[PDB]
Amino acid sequence: PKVYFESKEYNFSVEDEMDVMTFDLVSRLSSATSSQVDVSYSVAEPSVVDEYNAKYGTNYEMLDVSQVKLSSTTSSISSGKLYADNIEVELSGLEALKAGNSYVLPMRVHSSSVSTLSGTNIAYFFFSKPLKITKAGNFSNHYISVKFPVGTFFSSFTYEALINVDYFLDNNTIMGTEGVMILRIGDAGGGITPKDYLEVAGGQNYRVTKPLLTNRWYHVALTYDQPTGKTGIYVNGEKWAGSDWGIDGFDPNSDMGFYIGRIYGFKWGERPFHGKMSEVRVWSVARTENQLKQNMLGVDPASEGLALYYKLDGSETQEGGVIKDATGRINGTTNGITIKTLDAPIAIN
């Protein structure tokens, strides 16, 4: 007879503010025997998690062994029984775990009495820690003026943000460089683009074919892949419109330069956005559809290619007329972005 784990997998949720939890660890025999069978446990090698992720295409992160305590390392299965006496596993440091990841603790069973069954001697305990966005930045005649590093020339690029519109005026600025490359909603004064239609404008233009609602979160993105010439506008990860351009790129600093939320001082209309924004980014690459979809709620601010990042969740420093972005690269000038607490976490469906 052999020692093994009866149930391969268990799932736990790491609730808010939870730092410590305990669970039961039990192995068993394939069939009962006439003497006590001794067992012991250990945390399995991280490569066990890599094999699992490769087999299933999952993305589990291994917990640190330093946050695992066993009531005892050893146990036993009494003569005539199948299941080992319970061991309690205590997991700590849960509050510090990064949200938006799924974690695993793989436990191996060993025996000094009998053999264990390969492929059945690891128990997998999974821990989910949900990423939520519960705060966002208010725009009601507010701007962020952004100066990119000198000689910035975006060839391929991405603008993206989570937005929630309070109301639509004729032309509502999201982000960009007016007259050059700007993402907006509407240009109804021009009698072509309805007030609630996403549009890219500047040296060249195109627009979507369905309106946005008010009081609803959307993820919105504009990409341009300069080598292929393909540009797209994406809403909630779906391509809503596309075009083909021949331009080599654009200088975001040209003219009045780059603005978020309001083209401050523009004589032909400041075109303020009225609503909230979150997770506002500019990249110096064309992000793929998959990259846009998978990262709507958060990205590492250290990411290569990320030229500007405002979470607008309260974690950015605002002082002295400046709002410092998350990359540490951009000190934007602003009239102040009040961080609002949402009624519920951001949901796009």
Give which of 235, 240, 260, 238 is closest to 162, Cα–Cα.
235
Which of the following CATH numbers is that of domain 1-132: 3.60.21.70, 3.30.420.40, 3.30.160.40, 2.60.40.1740? 2.60.40.1740
Identity of the residue numbered 11: N
Question: What CATH number should be reported for the domain whose range is 133-343?
Answer: 2.60.120.200
Region for 79 from its dihedrals, namely left if φ exceeds 0, alpha if ψ lies in -120 to 50, beta otherwise: beta
Give which of 172, 276, 286 is closest to 221, Cα–Cα.
286
Which residue in this structure is represented by tokens 């040296």?
A: 203
For the chain, give every domain's residue range: 1-132, 133-343
Q: Cα separation of 125 and 104, whole Å?
A: 5
Identity of the residue numbered 317: T
Q: Cα separation of 245 and 227, whole Å?
A: 10
